[PDB]
Design a protein around this ligand. Structure first.
Ligand SMILES: *[C@@H]1O[C@H](CO)[C@@H](O[C@@H]2O[C@H](CO)[C@@H](O[C@@H]3O[C@H](CO[C@H]4O[C@H](CO)[C@@H](O)[C@H](O)[C@@H]4O)[C@@H](O)[C@H](O[C@H]4O[C@H](CO)[C@@H](O)[C@H](O)[C@@H]4O)[C@@H]3O)[C@H](O)[C@H]2NC(C)=O)[C@H](O)[C@H]1NC(C)=O
Ligand SMILES: *[C@@H]1O[C@H](CO)[C@@H](O[C@@H]2O[C@H](CO)[C@@H](O[C@@H]3O[C@H](CO[C@H]4O[C@H](CO)[C@@H](O)[C@H](O)[C@@H]4O)[C@@H](O)[C@H](O[C@H]4O[C@H](CO)[C@@H](O)[C@H](O)[C@@H]4O)[C@@H]3O)[C@H](O)[C@H]2NC(C)=O)[C@H](O)[C@H]1NC(C)=O
Ligand SMILES: *[C@@H]1O[C@H](CO)[C@@H](O[C@@H]2O[C@H](CO)[C@@H](O[C@@H]3O[C@H](CO[C@H]4O[C@H](CO)[C@@H](O)[C@H](O)[C@@H]4O)[C@@H](O)[C@H](O[C@H]4O[C@H](CO)[C@@H](O)[C@H](O)[C@@H]4O)[C@@H]3O)[C@H](O)[C@H]2NC(C)=O)[C@H](O)[C@H]1NC(C)=O
Ligand SMILES: CC(=O)N[C@H]1[C@H]([C@H](O)[C@H](O)CO)O[C@@](OC[C@H]2O[C@@H](O)[C@H](O)[C@@H](O)[C@H]2O)(C(=O)O)C[C@@H]1O
Ligand SMILES: CC(=O)N[C@H]1[C@H]([C@H](O)[C@H](O)CO)O[C@@](OC[C@H]2O[C@@H](O)[C@H](O)[C@@H](O)[C@H]2O)(C(=O)O)C[C@@H]1O
Ligand SMILES: CC(=O)N[C@H]1[C@H]([C@H](O)[C@H](O)CO)O[C@@](OC[C@H]2O[C@@H](O)[C@H](O)[C@@H](O)[C@H]2O)(C(=O)O)C[C@@H]1O
Ligand SMILES: *[C@@H]1O[C@H](CO)[C@@H](O[C@@H]2O[C@H](CO)[C@@H](O)[C@H](O)[C@H]2NC(C)=O)[C@H](O)[C@H]1NC(C)=O
Ligand SMILES: *[C@@H]1O[C@H](CO)[C@@H](O[C@@H]2O[C@H](CO)[C@@H](O)[C@H](O)[C@H]2NC(C)=O)[C@H](O)[C@H]1NC(C)=O
Ligand SMILES: *[C@@H]1O[C@H](CO)[C@@H](O[C@@H]2O[C@H](CO)[C@@H](O)[C@H](O)[C@H]2NC(C)=O)[C@H](O)[C@H]1NC(C)=O
Ligand SMILES: *[C@@H]1O[C@H](CO)[C@@H](O)[C@H](O)[C@H]1NC(C)=O
Ligand SMILES: *[C@@H]1O[C@H](CO)[C@@H](O)[C@H](O)[C@H]1NC(C)=O
Ligand SMILES: *[C@@H]1O[C@H](CO)[C@@H](O)[C@H](O)[C@H]1NC(C)=O
Ligand SMILES: *[C@@H]1O[C@H](CO)[C@@H](O)[C@H](O)[C@H]1NC(C)=O
Ligand SMILES: *[C@@H]1O[C@H](CO)[C@@H](O)[C@H](O)[C@H]1NC(C)=O
Ligand SMILES: *[C@@H]1O[C@H](CO)[C@@H](O)[C@H](O)[C@H]1NC(C)=O
Ligand SMILES: *[C@@H]1O[C@H](CO)[C@@H](O)[C@H](O)[C@H]1NC(C)=O
Ligand SMILES: *[C@@H]1O[C@H](CO)[C@@H](O)[C@H](O)[C@H]1NC(C)=O
Ligand SMILES: *[C@@H]1O[C@H](CO)[C@@H](O)[C@H](O)[C@H]1NC(C)=O
Ligand SMILES: *[C@@H]1O[C@H](CO)[C@@H](O)[C@H](O)[C@H]1NC(C)=O
Ligand SMILES: *[C@@H]1O[C@H](CO)[C@@H](O)[C@H](O)[C@H]1NC(C)=O
Ligand SMILES: *[C@@H]1O[C@H](CO)[C@@H](O)[C@H](O)[C@H]1NC(C)=O
Ligand SMILES: *[C@@H]1O[C@H](CO)[C@@H](O)[C@H](O)[C@H]1NC(C)=O
Ligand SMILES: *[C@@H]1O[C@H](CO)[C@@H](O)[C@H](O)[C@H]1NC(C)=O
Ligand SMILES: *[C@@H]1O[C@H](CO)[C@@H](O)[C@H](O)[C@H]1NC(C)=O
Lengths: 173, 317, 317, 173, 173, 317
């Protein structure tokens, strides 16, 4: 939420992207295509796995403790045993609730971040050859076949090759 | 014509609802449960050494009630006491029962060493019909009911040094008679006194004659006491009657042992975390099965579910 | 010429200072207090059932001190003990006073059922000038001071079964005489003994003759004891003198009741959270009024203020 | 603070905006105007209400506890009663302090975020018809009357209608 | 990490910048230079000092407590003393672990933020006179000597002075 | 040609590894340690008032064992008990030793005021060879061993009012003889009884005759008791023999005092935080030196290191 991409300027997710978490759709002369971006996908996944590594399979060993159920009325010592346990449980219950709320807010934010970073990187790559339409799509002002699109997705697109064509199309009357 | 290039992200048809700092319900693509809320209902016999008490409480197995003879010298990580347990020997009480139960539970052993006390002047091995062992009248196996020899019970003044590396635990008792007849028949004199001492401690106990409600037909009682004797200290027992003497000492260990009340069956399986409801998996950090646990266990919390997001916000088409 | 379009945000002339992770003082447009720090100074009589002890401690109302006769059989959610309370009956002590006070407080009832004990052989209903009820000499209403009948006090051996669904609480006592004369006049013999027992427990108490500093002119004392008797168990009282007998039993309940020491007045108003300083609102998560609370209460913290930002950073023109 | 808009590239707040938290000021041929943006305003407010929903009116019921004041000296059991209570209070006091510090840092950041998101959305809407001046203001390079400004604020501005006029004004010598 | 500058579009740090945390390198007609930006540097440092002020030198006084080591076996009361202490220590150990993990994530993020904010401010300053190359560098399309670079670093650069030269260089064929 | 302008950030050749929410190892430019893990090994004598017990336990200094005469009327913030301490007087025990040690420790003073008790009818100042003071037989300095005068020991009934602003602490005892001879020589009669009382309390203790293992050749014992007397209350001592009487009272204060077991040397230096391992600096919020602390101390945690990032991520060239 905090970066404004996911559930923001990107209108919705893609149910048909099943091989990654982030990616590219395009329309060009050769049709309409989709490809996942593995590096952004792995960046988000590695962070979430980092949280899981800190939460799953990490338990503490305890052995002999105090009694926690009683069949007789006893007064002062029993009151104290019960209060100690109730105190402990409330403090752990608080910790658990807060942990999950904070971590979830952060997961939502870091996943939005990864989307934004991919968008920004792509924008910079295109230089003066494209304009941002505001909905996560770029209008590319030159002929850009499947190999050209591939070049953008692989970080190898050379903007200088198309700059003259693009400027002429963009800044027309 | 040019081209269009759109950046985006996945979504799923079946998202899950989680809580955040700013929203109590937001849908994400995937989540995982952090609270363990189920058990199989069995206590796994591995990898902890489980001792099923069956009909016996720990204290009954300690004193040596006849039905508990199979427990002699056993060790445990976890002793399991069942709600069907019952005593079937001479009726007794333990002032501070809960402490003796605790200190034996955490020691984790019933290892017992016989000692030869010099009981000259009295009749050893007193027995009762309230404590049947193999059809015969009997008594607690670890205790020695001393009575008169030829209608005399002289003062006892008996010593036992601790020359070991470890603390010795001595269990002993006083017989409180139901009537005057229950005092005369065994000791054949007015009144007893017991003083049990060490260099560092002393305990004196007086029998109190009086009718108590009959338990397994007996209106008398035994009151059970204990004494720990350190290395280099000496046990001294001074009695004029009514002494339920020790036959020796228990080893007291330290380590990870405990005791739990449960009616769950023991199963052949392997689980690190035991609750009275059964063993539970310990992959999750939290659990709401039971506040009582033993082993490598999730921490008990009040919530029955806490879902951790493992994916982005779900924004379906 | 064209146009200019400026994006911006509001600000206020009167911002408030909050703390953050990186700055101990930053001004925001608005904030709200999370620590409740005031009370009206009254304990609201709703929605909890309040019992104002007035001149009576809970233990005095239990035993039945004459000024506490109005408390018979009352129930409470919260019993309020006042610092002006005082005892006005025979002087007494309660070994483990704090435990008896606690267990009665949490039970939440003074419901008492009379029982007919077979006291044949003694004079019932002993009284004293230190315990005036309606100008006459009297005693604790729930206790029965037994004395000699025609200069004999025979051994008492009296039984009372528990055939109820609930635990019975028995309150009883021993008279410790100030002198030899205080032993002879009531019991007319050398020394008493009291044994109170059940299937599962026994308590024996010996009177100790001796002068104590006079309280309301009395150098003797009563020592108060208690016994809980489970369903199917039986109470047995065996005495040779000096017994302050029960007249019956108290019902012991479980639930949400407690006791609090406070001198705050009770008001006609409705508040869920009670402190000894008065009721407090419970909208805030935290409070610094008192560590002692009863009801749906904010959690006690040491801070007297914690401000939660409810607006953006304030950046005035 | 973390996005750089509030107390950053936006020099200060507007005391005269009393009907929303975020908004627009403009200068055009017809004068100088101000209007609140209700959607960004509500986005921030809903998040803050989310925190309040998790903090206000949520108390736990406790009943019989342990004693916490004593008139007599007693030693070991009393020492333990006092220590349990002191331990509990320190742990809750810690929780409270940290909660407020974290939440406040986050409120400041999420409100800055909403400002940034509104700025970014407006920038994208204007396409090649305006330039960012660096202080949260856009120079719009075409005649843009009250209805045109309204169109930008309502998300209905059609940049193509003005593009020829704007490019000619922008890229002049 | 969350903004994408540090360990992101900025390929690496500069070991030779020893007088600040953030800064500028340039290449122009007069050579290649480096200068620290003191305001961004101080912004990051002040935030970190804020955390330190909340953690260093803030200890609580405690005096008489409970016993925490024992030479004798005692049972119930001793079990309770030990359990209270073990409970307390686990709760503080948890607090400490979480505090450091959260604060460190936040320090990494706020330092990335300050880098991003400086980049954005510089970009806006240059207006139509430069293009972003995607690696934290701007190509400036006019002669920009040492005084001109100084002007950008000091926030005094007047883009209008160079706009005609720059547009002519940028939008050439 | 134009120009190139690059934005960037510093890096260092020697970064440090920290933990975050998403990564257990990430390199930053600088970090600082939050867990104090070392001590010098000395307890600093400033700014807290330290009392080194040397050969004396607090209880020995209280009773007045001869080697502890130098402690009379001393005050402390922290009393330091050494593992080499030993008793060298008449052998004794203290039922609830730990409570008396605690209440004296927290009071923080051995201030003692002598009182003149009316002991007419007995011989004062009894002594023993097990308690040598300056080559002579002696006794605990704060205690008065009463014996027969001309082979009679009449009943004692002695009173002492508290007219002070503060609570008085009275320490007293009972002599338990090893044999019949140890009862006859000092009191020259069958049996003693002690009742110590106030308006609000009473304690009665009976000597128990019997052999205990000899300690410094003595098979008898003294059992030590205590009584707090409030302002306006009165102490009453009623004995027929075997009384180890008080010579007066200790002042009981409240404040910040305590006691610690340590064998660390005391040094001339200034540190606010004391552990049994030595004083530790208190700049860091946490420590893993010892769970036992006194003063302004970091909070004990289980981790031995926790590194707080004080710089950005380190991304070397
Ligand atoms: C929604 O989000 C969760 C969490 O990110 C995902 O659940 C994880 O999925 C992975 C991959 O399927 C699981 O990995 C597997 O773990 C097995 C052990 O499982 C038990 O033990 C763990 C504790 O460590 C418990 O959490 C768990 O509940 C089980 O009781 C391994 O046996 C598996 O190994 C397999 O592959 C490797 C080769 O790589 C081989 O060595 C093995 O022989 C075997 O074939 C594997 O590692 C992981 O356990 C899940 N985590 C949790 C917390 O549940 C969901 O997949 C995700 N959903 C979607 C749709 O993406
Ligand atoms: C600064 O920030 C705070 C928090 O965001 C704002 O305070 C809130 O303001 C709203 C709107 O005025 C308040 O809403 C009202 O709550 C009343 C109940 O108040 C009591 O109970 C709550 C616990 O639930 C306590 O927190 C509070 O202190 C009171 O003791 C309702 O009675 C009000 O209802 C009114 O309107 C509705 C119709 O919508 C009707 O049904 C009612 O009959 C009535 O007319 C209303 O809901 C809210 O209580 C405040 N919250 C807190 C925590 O204080 C400040 O307004 C804000 N300042 C500025 C300048 O913006
Ligand atoms: C890596 O990160 C850490 C934390 O940001 C930096 O460590 C800090 O460095 C500063 C500057 O050198 C230190 O400031 C000095 O503190 C001294 C007191 O030190 C003791 O007491 C503190 C508790 O308050 C302990 O934390 C510390 O361990 C010491 O035991 C002062 O005496 C110093 O004052 C000097 O300058 C002033 C003038 O400004 C004069 O008044 C003094 O007379 C004196 O000359 C100074 O204030 C600070 O203590 C450090 N903090 C911590 C937590 O260690 C590292 O510098 C940083 N590394 C790099 C390479 O940047
Ligand atoms: C060591 C010894 O004296 N054993 C006796 C025992 C004791 O004298 C007695 O329990 C002390 O209180 O008494 C036994 O008999 C008495 C017993 O007889 C039963 O038939 C009856 O059920 C009981 O009420 C009681 O009268 C005993 O078994 O306890 C005999 C034993 O040898
Ligand atoms: C049941 C009974 O015996 N009641 C007596 C009572 C007791 O015998 C006595 O309290 C036992 O210790 O004694 C009463 O009188 C003695 C009492 O007389 C007062 O005048 C005086 O103030 C006291 O010091 C004391 O001598 C009593 O009221 O306690 C009479 C009562 O009937
Ligand atoms: C006040 C008094 O009576 N002091 C005696 C003391 C006591 O009578 C006795 O300790 C009471 O139990 O006895 C002393 O002597 C007996 C003592 O003699 C030693 O030689 C021997 O080592 C001991 O075993 C024992 O027989 C004493 O010193 O304790 C004399 C003292 O004056
Ligand atoms: C004291 O009273 C109890 C109860 O009446 C007596 O105990 C009963 O004794 C009979 C035989 O006399 C048994 O059949 C019952 O089982 C006993 N009941 C209980 C509850 O124990 C007791 O014998 C009396 N004591 C004396 C010394 O007379
Ligand atoms: C033991 O001493 C106390 C105190 O001297 C005696 O109690 C006083 O008795 C007188 C009458 O004799 C009363 O007027 C006082 O109120 C009593 N004082 C206190 C403090 O109780 C007590 O009587 C003596 N006991 C014996 C048996 O002689
Ligand atoms: C009871 O037994 C003990 C141990 O035998 C006796 O104490 C010993 O007495 C001798 C002298 O008779 C001393 O030299 C020893 O040091 C004592 N040993 C211990 C362990 O104290 C004790 O005297 C006997 N008591 C009676 C009354 O006969
Ligand atoms: C881009 O990378 C993919 C490998 O995943 C390859 O199949 C494709 O041909 C590449 N195209 C270009 C233009 O680099
Ligand atoms: C959604 O469905 C898939 C396939 O049935 C399943 O594996 C997955 O766990 C489900 N996800 C959620 C969030 O329920
Ligand atoms: C336990 O006691 C019950 C009930 O008398 C009996 O049926 C069972 O055989 C006993 N079990 C053992 C193991 O002794
Ligand atoms: C202890 O035994 C001795 C030696 O027989 C005797 O003199 C003494 O009375 C006994 N004491 C007790 C309390 O039994
Ligand atoms: C476990 O046993 C306890 C017995 O008190 C019961 O209350 C609890 O609900 C059980 N939990 C589960 C998950 O079976
Ligand atoms: C500022 O003033 C207004 C109007 O008097 C008041 O309602 C509001 O609560 C005040 N805000 C702060 C933050 O003090
Ligand atoms: C309580 O005692 C005081 C003081 O003797 C008296 O004035 C008042 O009337 C008593 N109140 C009640 C309710 O008995
Ligand atoms: C109990 O009462 C019985 C029967 O009268 C009697 O024989 C016995 O001595 C009494 N015991 C006591 C301690 O009073
Ligand atoms: C409440 O009462 C306690 C009595 O100990 C007092 O110390 C405290 O300051 C009072 N608080 C308020 C807010 O009145
Ligand atoms: C924009 O929306 C507002 C409604 O709040 C309306 O008054 C205005 O006329 C609209 N203008 C345009 C150009 O859409
Ligand atoms: C920029 O500021 C620095 C002061 O740090 C100064 O030396 C330099 O000459 C300034 N240059 C311009 C062009 O403002
Ligand atoms: C790196 O080296 C410098 C100079 O030796 C030293 O002052 C600094 O503390 C070191 N930093 C780290 C993170 O180890
Ligand atoms: C303490 O006792 C030891 C061992 O007997 C002795 O050497 C030392 O002198 C004593 N110290 C003091 C201060 O009395
Ligand atoms: C207390 O002293 C009085 C008066 O001498 C005497 O009558 C009584 O027996 C004594 N009591 C005890 C227990 O010593
Ligand atoms: C401090 O003393 C304790 C004694 O239990 C020891 O276990 C601990 O490791 C010591 N710590 C240090 C840092 O010396």
């Amino acid at each position: 939420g905090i970066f404004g991409a996911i559930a923001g300027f990107i209108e919705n997710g893609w149910e048909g992207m099943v091989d990654g978490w982030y990616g590219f759709r395009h329309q060009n002369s050769e049709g309409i295509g989709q490809a996942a971006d593995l590096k952004s996908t792995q960046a988000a996944i590695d962070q979430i796995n980092g949280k899981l590594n800190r939460l799953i399979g990490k338990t503490n060993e305890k052995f002999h403790q105090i009694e926690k159920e009683f069949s007789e009325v006893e007064g002062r010592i029993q009151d104290l045993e019960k209060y100690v346990e109730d105190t402990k449980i409330d403090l752990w219950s608080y910790n658990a609730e807060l942990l999950v709320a904070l971590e979830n807010q952060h997961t939502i934010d870091l996943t939005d971040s990864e989307m934004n970073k991919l968008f920004e990187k792509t924008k910079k790559q295109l230089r003066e050859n494209a304009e941002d339409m505001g909905n996560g799509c770029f209008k590319i002002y030159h002929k850009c076949d499947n190999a050209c699109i591939g070049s953008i997705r692989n970080g190898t697109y050379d903007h200088d090759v198309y700059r003259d064509e693009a400027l002429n199309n963009r800044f027309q009357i | 014509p040019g081209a269009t290039l759109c950046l985006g992200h996945h979504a799923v048809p079946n998202g899950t609802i989680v809580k955040t700092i700013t929203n109590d319900q937001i849908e994400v693509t995937n989540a995982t449960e952090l609270v363990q809320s189920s058990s199989t209902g069995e206590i796994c016999d591995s990898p902890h050494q489980i001792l099923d008490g069956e009909n016996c409480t720990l204290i009954d197995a300690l004193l040596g009630d006849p039905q508990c003879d199979g427990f002699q010298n056993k060790k445990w990580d976890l002793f399991v006491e069942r709600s069907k347990a019952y005593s079937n020997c001479y009726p007794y009480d333990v002032p501070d029962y809960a402490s003796l139960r605790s200190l034996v539970a955490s020691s984790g052993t019933l290892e017992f060493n016989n000692e030869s006390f010099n009981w000259t002047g009295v009749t050893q091995n007193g027995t009762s019909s309230a404590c049947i062992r193999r059809s015969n009248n009997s008594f607690f196996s670890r205790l020695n009911w001393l009575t008169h020899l030829k209608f005399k019970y002289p003062a006892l003044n008996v010593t036992m040094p601790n020359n070991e590396k470890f603390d010795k635990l001595y269990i002993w008792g006083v017989h409180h008679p139901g009537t005057d007849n229950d005092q005369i028949f065994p000791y054949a004199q007015a009144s007893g006194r017991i003083t049990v001492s060490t260099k560092r401690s002393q305990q004196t106990v007086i029998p109190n004659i009086g009718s108590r409600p009959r338990v397994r037909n007996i209106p008398s009682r035994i009151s059970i006491y204990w004494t720990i004797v350190k290395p280099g200290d000496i046990l001294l027992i001074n009695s004029t009657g009514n002494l339920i003497a020790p036959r020796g000492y228990f080893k007291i260990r330290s380590g990870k042992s405990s005791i739990m009340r449960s009616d769950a069956p023991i199963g052949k399986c392997n689980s690190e975390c035991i609750t009275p409801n059964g063993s539970i998996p310990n992959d999750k950090p939290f659990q709401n099965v039971n506040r009582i646990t033993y082993g490598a266990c999730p921490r008990y919390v009040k919530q029955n579910t806490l879902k951790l997001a493992t994916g982005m916000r779900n924004v379906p088409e």
